[PDB]
Design a protein around this ligand. Structure first.
Ligand SMILES: [Mg+2]
Ligand SMILES: [Mg+2]
Ligand SMILES: [Mg+2]
Lengths: 544, 541, 540
């Protein structure tokens, strides 16, 4: 009684069966460029006795094929950040994918209902819940529309247009909201709640900024790789072709949590002056004696000038330039050809070479330049981002570099840089409203900007905050009119325009799925019911 | 501006699906399942994207499990689980699992606001509770599979197996509103791991526990429509979800309408023409600022001579100028009785033929102030409603005020006479005092005995509540008296001796499972391993 | 169209509020509470609309309750509650209530996805669990007041009173992210009925249970800032919320940064110049597809060669095996200046070692780093005292996780902390992660709490007791149930419930049926046909 018996032979057989099924799965064309560091054995062991098929995975497939065709045609899947079921329902007419924004979720959709700026400090399940919000709306309107169609004749169907409500969703996972085990659980939720793809950034959690905020802290290249692996591990266990997007904030970031990773060393800023002591501790000693405010910032600005902060290669070049060396231009090139952004040369190794080339132990101390929190100083730009792009590419179906402006040149630099080493890598671009767009570009360029980036291989592009702003404009404008001119504002500003532009929602009972539900009502009540919602009396005969 | 489609492929796929549904419905699972809509009707309700809810597999597992029990005339017996701990330990011993609405009211409302069993928590409360347990089952299944498959074949065969994935049957109360509500409620239950749900012929605004008083019923048809609506939902979203129909008509004394002919036999009315509207009489007395009021009711009731119409017909004949009286009752009783579905107009017509009176009967006047009609159910009323629900319901269930074998037999026999292959379910309620109601020898065999009558699923609704309540109160008492000795003595030693898996709680909670995931992702090795050297569970070896 | 405002009244109200806060902060409750911001700073953070969270009253109740316990040298002892049933029965016997993160991981995640104690459920999980219990407490308090006040004065005095409203102390783990996270987490805890919350100096998303292994610490200052952030939140939203500081430094072996001078003593490094970067050596071996236990072989080899120790161990070692006179006396020059509590930075300690020996004694803690980048760390009880003292200004209770229930160690830590902060309340985990019949005999068990009470551990809790009592009870009954049917329920549960006076066996009354019938009749003008506890109910 007290337990359940099992056939031990059938157990092994089923295990082996599954291992093979996974191996076959992984051999599909979808995974052609997808590096996995674990075995199918490793994954099968993690699964349970009961297989579950998450429909989100079908939208992953739909997304991958959709992006394949776009890459082949050198054209773009362009979308923006959806707020709510209304957005996805109207978007589906025009666009072929859908972005769920963490920024927008912070302000409008936290599960504690407590809003914030884009700090990813809402509870973990916030964006996953937002996807389900939209997912389930998509599914509902798809269900509504199918009934509307199939209660028409074949003759009538062919007249009435079709909306594909089921546009694949790509959702913000921020920095993964904690460790590896967190990221697995976060991914699990995203899969369960209808995510076609999720993106994830090489920032430290709980210093997490928007892409165009300041004071961004990075994590070691490997640490963020492990994040991407962890997503994949989760998707492999629970059986989704979930797309993974890797984001780097290293264009603009000035800080990093550790020096542990050799790839980062080139970019870690340090002091060239032996006399400079620990800035962190110097500030602490000045603060404890009640120096505060702008007189304290004086001591920093003094220490920084004295410390001579730079990247180690700048320091090597500086030694050679101002030094007793015969053939200087040629001697920098010996160093720069071996040691550069992409070259992955550790610091020990780069010092060793500098010694060979100059005969000095050139002094360099990046411990002393640390911030009070302990972060190391860091000088990324586009080339740093390429370095990290390349590193992530094996693990990531799309690659994405946050930029401070909508600069074509920079976008090309990054695209070219990445594709040189991984030419088949899909890229993604933030079309951010954090840019002033009429200040940055004339309108002729605006019109073609997406297309142009499409050529460089940015197959997925999104305006992160467009849903926020369209809504914000619309509601403010109407509220203003409403306050001035009463119900005329509604006739004039909203409802007439809705009719003229063919917007489906103005017939809002039908749109909301009333005739769909009347179907379910009659069906259950044996064909007929006295409480029919769209029967004689409904006030939508005023819209015919 | 839109998306184009092949209109021909549309129709083709539609037709494909209609056929798939027809084939589905023809499976042995649906052998007794009446459907009042077509496969066409259902396919039209579905979307373009098929979704497979794993809950449905647990429905299958539950059905087969109950099939075998019915065939062997034995019982799947379980009780009301509170939380992941319960299901994890229950899975060792029991083969199904009950999620109680009563318990959810007190312990698991989604607003966190507790209550007595009134089903006035938010609708998603029990569906969320199932997912609570569902996901725990799935997790511990996942944990255990890793533990096993990292052992050798030699070692596996030594270590026992737990089937964590016991099918869940969950309280849907009265469906928490109209038909559209019930569809949406069922959808959630399917999505969140329900193998089966049960649903009761009470009115929603007034929903009681089964062993509370003042229970209001709904018309037979109305509750049938509820069951149909569940089935409609399960059909659309593609689950073999089991439906359980409950009737509270054993004890209930009120009903919302007289509209349904089947109910008429049981609707109580006044035999005295002189009695006026009780409701309005009370209202007039209250508005003049009148226990003295309850006096006016108790007077009106005696004067009104309340009874069932057949009692009134029998009474007329008995105390009447009629020659062959016993034989004249039987003419009426054979045609008009609990199971006979005879409307009131029809029963009056016959009474006129048999006596020559329009025997006076007014059930409007006996109405409660809220408007409910008065109602006298018992076990035979419940059989009537059982039979009515049976076509629409995989299990049938009659709430009882006591654990009475005779009554249980009466109801089982009564239902099976008309539907002999109908599975039955029985509440083994802690609302009964069980040592007062029978001796312990009978207690031991009570489930088995009901199994013979065909009660294939039985549950103690509130057992999880009470075991926990005892355990925590007892330990808290000890704890307060003799400190940490209470824990060594009352809990942790017993845990070791009884082999309870949770005392090694790091392992039980799935730490070694997650360390697996951690190492796997970190390329085989990691410095932050949770069950590495240092963990204090080497004190349990 | 905007709204106008009196600019003068604005300033006046601002100033009014600043003063109200200053007065608040001067109350006896904050006598030991260091604040690094002004009342100005806080008032600016508040809105125009004052909100009073009832949780704060339970904070007061908790503080006074602990005051009296400290004065009497006795203990508020409790354990980890699962659900409304627990708090309702606990309230009879105990005077505070613990909400466990460990238990929440397994039983109460808001995604419904369970786990081991990794604090990787969503942030709102424990806050939601407090509200679960909070609202139950409030409900049963409300039920009981109606029951009492519908009795006569004569009858009231016969029927016993339960204080359902026992203050709740809840697990905040490591705060679930940065400072802004911790503010938001604290806000929720206040809104949802937390009397106090506790918080640990581990790194987030490596977060372990206290008695799991591979624990990573954060710099002393970083965890101080966490405690400040709690206080900042409680100050803004106006709770006397108690803050508990936990340190996992007894057992922890890793730390995220070396930035904080206080930590330096405890940071482990390599004494062998020849040892190169372990991290990078592992990375090169991994990228060639060495994995698993053969990789851990390369580590175990490198570690032996590297000669890992604390810098002072290295200084002592140099002097001991060295050409020095007066060796014993020369260690003491160093140890008296440089030790666990002495806060001596590494540069400073090397400088002294040079003065005392004339070597730059080699020490490299960068090379011993784990692959994730963590530095190696050797805490014990003295490290924990160091951190206790550091946290004490910011924390109403102090708490050191221990691997065993060892009296000596508990005394060491209590004495150590109170030496520098003698009025500091302490808290102790009475963990079921210990085997308790293996660790001590039963005579000692009975008195163990009391004895720790003397040392000043005013709040003690069994973290996982709710889990285990329930686990035993359900497993045992399920077993019986399966063996002897309904007899098991009569015998194992319901009879015992009657005999032990447990209130819940009359479960309709307990659940508040007669309370709600009250509300029903009241609204229906005195009378109703659908009364839940009328004639017919089976509780007669
Ligand atoms: Mg965002
Ligand atoms: Mg119930
Ligand atoms: Mg905890």
């Amino acid at each position: 009684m007290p337990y359940t018996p099992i056939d031990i032979q059938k157990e092994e057989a089923d295990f082996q069966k599954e291992v093979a099924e996974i191996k076959k799965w992984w051999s599909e064309p979808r995974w052609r460029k997808t590096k996995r560091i674990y075995s199918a054995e490793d994954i099968a062991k993690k699964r349970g006795t009961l297989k579950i098929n998450h429909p989100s995975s079908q939208q992953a497939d739909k997304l991958f094929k959709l992006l394949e065709k776009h890459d082949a045609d050198k054209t773009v899947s362009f979308t923006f950040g959806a707020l709510d079921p209304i957005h996805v329902a109207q978007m589906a007419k025009y666009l072929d994918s859908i972005y769920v924004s963490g920024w927008q979720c912070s302000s409008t959709a936290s599960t504690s209902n407590e809003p914030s700026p884009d700090l990813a400090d809402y509870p973990m399940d916030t964006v996953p819940n937002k996807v389900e919000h939209l997912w389930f709306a998509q599914l509902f309107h798809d269900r509504k529309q199918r009934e509307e169609r199939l209660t028409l004749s074949k003759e009538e169907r062919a007249k009435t247009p079709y909306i594909d409500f089921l546009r694949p969703i790509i959702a913000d996972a921020d920095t993964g909201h904690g460790g590896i085990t967190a990221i697995i659980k976060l991914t699990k939720m995203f899969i369960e709640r209808g995510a076609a793809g999720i993106h994830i950034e090489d920032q430290a959690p709980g210093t997490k900024k928007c892409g165009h905020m300041a004071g961004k802290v990075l994590v070691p290249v490997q640490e963020h790789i492990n994040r991407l692996v962890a997503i994949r591990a989760s998707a492999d266990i629970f059986g989704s072709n979930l797309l993974a997007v890797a984001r780097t904030d290293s264009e603009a970031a000035t800080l990093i949590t550790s020096t542990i990773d050799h790839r980062d060393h080139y970019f870690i800023i340090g002091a060239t002056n032996p006399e400079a002591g620990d800035l962190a501790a110097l500030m602490a000693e000045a603060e404890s004696k009640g120096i505060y405010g702008n007189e304290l910032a004086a001591i920093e600005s003094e220490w920084t000038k004295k410390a001579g902060l730079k990247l180690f290669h700048e320091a090597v070049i500086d030694e050679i330039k101002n030094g007793n060396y015969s053939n200087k231009d040629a001697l920098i090139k010996k160093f720069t050809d071996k040691v550069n952004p992409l070259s992955h040369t550790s610091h020990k190794e780069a010092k060793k070479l500098a010694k060979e080339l100059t005969g000095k132990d050139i002094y360099f101390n990046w411990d002393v330049a640390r911030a009070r929190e302990g972060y190391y100083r860091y000088q990324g730009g586009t080339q740093c981002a390429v370095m990290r792009g390349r590193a992530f590419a094996p693990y990531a179906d799309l690659i994405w570099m946050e930029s401070a402006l909508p600069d074509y040149a920079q976008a090309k630099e990054f695209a070219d840089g990445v594709k040189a080493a991984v030419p088949d890598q899909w890229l993604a671009y933030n079309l951010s409203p954090s840019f002033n767009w009429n200040k940055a570009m004339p309108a002729d360029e605006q019109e073609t900007y997406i297309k142009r980036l499409g050529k460089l291989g940015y197959v997925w592009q999104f305006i992160t905050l467009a849903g926020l702003h369209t809504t914000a404009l619309a509601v403010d404008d109407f509220s203003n009119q409403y306050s001035q001119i009463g119900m005329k504002a509604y006739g004039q500003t909203v409802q007439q325009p809705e009719i003229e532009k063919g917007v489906e929602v103005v017939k809002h009972q039908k749109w909301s799925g009333a005739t769909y539900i009347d179907g379910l009502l009659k069906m259950v009540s044996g064909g007929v019911t006295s409480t029919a919602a769209m029967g004689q009396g409904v006030t939508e005969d005023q819209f015919k």
